[PDB]
Amino acid sequence: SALGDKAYEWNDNEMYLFRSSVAYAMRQYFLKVKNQMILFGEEDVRVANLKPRISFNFFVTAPKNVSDIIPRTEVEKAIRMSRSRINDAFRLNDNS
Amino acid sequence: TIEEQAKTFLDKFNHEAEDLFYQSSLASWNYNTNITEENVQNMNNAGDKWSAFLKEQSTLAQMYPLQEIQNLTVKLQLQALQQNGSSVLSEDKSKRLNTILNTMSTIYSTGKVCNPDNPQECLLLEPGLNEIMANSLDYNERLWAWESWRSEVGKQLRPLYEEYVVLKNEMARANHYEDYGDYWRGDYEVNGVDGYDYSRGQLIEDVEHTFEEIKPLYEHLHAYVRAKLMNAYPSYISPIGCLPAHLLGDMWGRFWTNLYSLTVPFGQKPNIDVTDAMVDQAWDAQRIFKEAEKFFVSVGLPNMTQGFWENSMLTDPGNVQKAVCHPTAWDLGKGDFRILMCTKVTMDDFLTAHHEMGHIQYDMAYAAQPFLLRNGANEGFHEAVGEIMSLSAATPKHLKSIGLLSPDFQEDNETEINFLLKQALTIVGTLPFTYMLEKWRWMVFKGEIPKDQWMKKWWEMKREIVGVVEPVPHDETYCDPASLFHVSNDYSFIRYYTRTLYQFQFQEALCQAAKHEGPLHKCDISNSTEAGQKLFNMLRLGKSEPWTLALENVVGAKNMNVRPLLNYFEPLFTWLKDQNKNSFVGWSTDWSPYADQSIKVRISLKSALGDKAYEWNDNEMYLFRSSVAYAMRQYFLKVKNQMILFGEEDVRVANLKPRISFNFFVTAPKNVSDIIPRTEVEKAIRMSRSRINDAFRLNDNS
Amino acid sequence: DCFSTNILTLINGFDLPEGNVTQENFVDMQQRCNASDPAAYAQLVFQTCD
């Protein structure tokens, strides 16, 4: 819908880029609000239920602690804060 | 008181201190001779009691102001008993500091790294990794060991070091000192002598003055070693650049001696070696000590008492019992001196026996002095005095005169050159490292180096003082200097500089007094009563007078001097100047081992965005590294048809500037030594430049 | 345009922040960079447009 023609193919490298973008967003939110330097990585974004529609679930954990799961509220806040950067990193616009 | 009550206090303190300390020495000696569990607690309680006695004696010394004291000896003893130490620090802060020191020591002692292709084979430092660094001739293996040890140790030791420096600085400031560095430098401080004073701040100036004179010989030696390292690692070392840090035969580059097998001047002709003559004559591990005692007697110095010879543990048992046999001299006191060592039949054991014999002679020379004054003049005198005996005894002339090394031997100057170069690799190769490390620590304590720039400054010094370049860039998360044993265990490092200067000053003075033909490297002082008298004139003083006065009694100088060292190494300097006609003597602080394959990036945010432009920080650097990794993954998948998992930690970044310009390069995922060539990175960036640009809202010019 | 190019060449040569050397403060910064270290300012070629 966003690209029509000239659209790229989605593979595991695009999943890596998406995980990196989400980690960057969480880092930015934690730095700019809570004033904490937390080193979120792309291995803290756990992804499940991948479908050919390109739909999946994800959640975020603490950098070195699998038991600690960041609640959905601040994940929503971070996505709201950095949605524009997330979108233009992939050439999609808020509907795609 | 006053004088009478102070003398009574000192006498009654010493009357107990002698026997407490004596029993503690028996406990330690009995532990060391045989490892017995029942004596461990005996050592522990005795040491705790001795520490409590010292603490209480310190507490009962506060009611003695220092302005009413006329005698100098009691003044020095009261000052040596007056320092608070860690007592003034708060209880919670003291507990925190002790915990952090213990954690630091434990991390250094029991940290291990692991192979990237066999994670079930992991090596400690002193076994394995040290041998990898000391014996391997492979560039890749040495680089792997270097980088892998530095990574984990720095990452674990950084925050602990920051908290430790903060706490130590606060404690030192609480004790009327500028910082911790001033407290460390205060060992050489002497006052109230009206003619021999030495300020704390003069030490820095003296050290810089000495290094400025030592620089040229080190420059020639560095150029010679760099020239000789080409044949071992071709296409890896620049003819005008520095030396890579991992090729120096040691983990940290403290000593260069392990390069002697690669840099020998004449390898076909060996140096002197008669260790087989001692084997042929069937010399047990008892004649060497008697020979050392005879040599010491010859100069007129006092001899060994029968009490020492009564207690002899030097013969290694070799049974199932395992005990440490590190050569040491024990000074339990009240006429009780011993040496504990494992004695074999070898040259190095012979020289170590002479070293320990000199240690014992110096230690018992000042026995008549009071207990609190039973020590060397400063921290550097003891080792220098112990070492110059072995240095004088190692000459082949003494070997010929002692019975070995039959006179039908015509010495060649090639052997002398080999010996001088081997000595240089140990003596001159370590002075820049010591100077640089102590300088960095002093300016870190003093606050000159911001906590943000530590790593930066450190490596800058290594490119300009030592002439050594790192093989991979290190960001601010590392603590490379903390990898040393001395820094992470809170030890001082300037004693190794001052001792190296003092030993050669003493050797030159002794040779000049003995009226040697020429003291180049073959000087010996055997059978010279005046030399022994001159040495004894300084040995027996102890700490009763400033070390400057002790130095004047031998060399007639009030400060450290470098001329005797240059005089000692003059023949090698002449040979090196002859051998470096074609080489470019010196180095340049711009060449880097990774600079050929790097790519420069310059970013102009204001031009592309104007207003509303975002601020650039480390999160943007993380995003840039991730984008570059994605680009490399895509290129390798879509052209070479290989599934390689590049990460954001394989993009190494250097030279960050406020213009937002930096260099970067890419390595293989788990292999650090493997660097992707610049052409492939160019192709990948060409392929994915559109996505790289649009991820940051910049357009091909910004 | 000529003045902007003259600013840009110095900015690139000396790796200064973009937005520090403007039209009003070009000469003082230009001579300060030269006074910092010769033999690196020398290779910079400036235009004398007026």
Ligand SMILES: *[C@@H]1O[C@H](CO)[C@@H](O[C@@H]2O[C@H](CO)[C@@H](O)[C@H](O)[C@H]2NC(C)=O)[C@H](O)[C@H]1NC(C)=O
């Ligand atoms: C990982 O995260 C959990 C919390 O999700 C941490 O668990 C805490 O552990 C301390 C123990 O002193 C408890 O007092 C806390 O109540 C625990 N938090 C809970 C139950 O929510 C755990 O310590 C973390 N592991 C780390 C940092 O290594």
Ligand SMILES: *[C@@H]1O[C@H](CO)[C@@H](O[C@@H]2O[C@H](CO)[C@@H](O)[C@H](O)[C@H]2NC(C)=O)[C@H](O)[C@H]1NC(C)=O
């Ligand atoms: C530790 O080693 C020594 C010698 O092997 C032994 O104990 C010593 O034995 C001698 C007798 O020759 C005594 O003079 C010493 O007093 C003993 N040392 C002591 C009691 O500390 C024995 O093998 C071990 N000593 C132990 C277990 O105490």
Ligand SMILES: *[C@@H]1O[C@H](CO)[C@@H](O[C@@H]2O[C@H](CO)[C@@H](O)[C@H](O)[C@H]2NC(C)=O)[C@H](O)[C@H]1NC(C)=O
């Ligand atoms: C140490 O204190 C004493 C004063 O009690 C002084 O030294 C004494 O000087 C006389 C000489 O007439 C000697 O007979 C004494 O044996 C000395 N007593 C000592 C050394 O304890 C002087 O004030 C100081 N002596 C020093 C620093 O050598």
Ligand SMILES: *[C@@H]1O[C@H](CO)[C@@H](O[C@@H]2O[C@H](CO)[C@@H](O)[C@H](O)[C@H]2NC(C)=O)[C@H](O)[C@H]1NC(C)=O
């Ligand atoms: C060691 O620490 C104690 C602090 O208890 C210092 O004692 C202080 O001495 C000063 C100077 O006379 C007095 O003004 C304080 O009242 C003392 N504090 C006390 C007794 O609690 C002691 O001087 C320190 N030792 C030094 C600096 O050498």
Ligand SMILES: *[C@@H]1O[C@H](CO)[C@@H](O[C@@H]2O[C@H](CO)[C@@H](O)[C@H](O)[C@H]2NC(C)=O)[C@H](O)[C@H]1NC(C)=O
């Ligand atoms: C210092 O000790 C040495 C021992 O190495 C003495 O040399 C021998 O000492 C014994 C005494 O037990 C004498 O019987 C020998 O005549 C001495 N000479 C030899 C070759 O064995 C030496 O005399 C002592 N030096 C002194 C007292 O000035």
Ligand SMILES: *[C@@H]1O[C@H](CO)[C@@H](O[C@@H]2O[C@H](CO)[C@@H](O)[C@H](O)[C@H]2NC(C)=O)[C@H](O)[C@H]1NC(C)=O
């Ligand atoms: C070692 O000794 C030989 C001869 O003793 C040296 O050869 C002479 O050295 C002098 C001065 O260096 C030169 O002027 C002569 O031309 C040399 N050849 C002769 C006299 O035939 C040799 O240079 C020395 N080599 C080292 C490394 O010391």
Ligand SMILES: *[C@@H]1O[C@H](CO)[C@@H](O[C@@H]2O[C@H](CO)[C@@H](O)[C@H](O)[C@H]2NC(C)=O)[C@H](O)[C@H]1NC(C)=O
């Ligand atoms: C890691 O580093 C290098 C790659 O640069 C690999 O070494 C290459 O392969 C063998 C070693 O067995 C040697 O010929 C050279 O060291 C290198 N040859 C080249 C670059 O042509 C090394 O094997 C790699 N180790 C791995 C992947 O486990």
Ligand SMILES: *[C@@H]1O[C@H](CO)[C@@H](O[C@@H]2O[C@H](CO)[C@@H](O)[C@H](O)[C@H]2NC(C)=O)[C@H](O)[C@H]1NC(C)=O
């Ligand atoms: C700035 O660069 C010029 C380039 O030469 C130098 O200026 C010298 O000093 C004064 C400046 O007023 C002139 O009279 C000289 O002709 C200049 N050239 C010389 C001495 O060779 C110098 O590098 C720098 N000058 C200043 C003021 O910063």
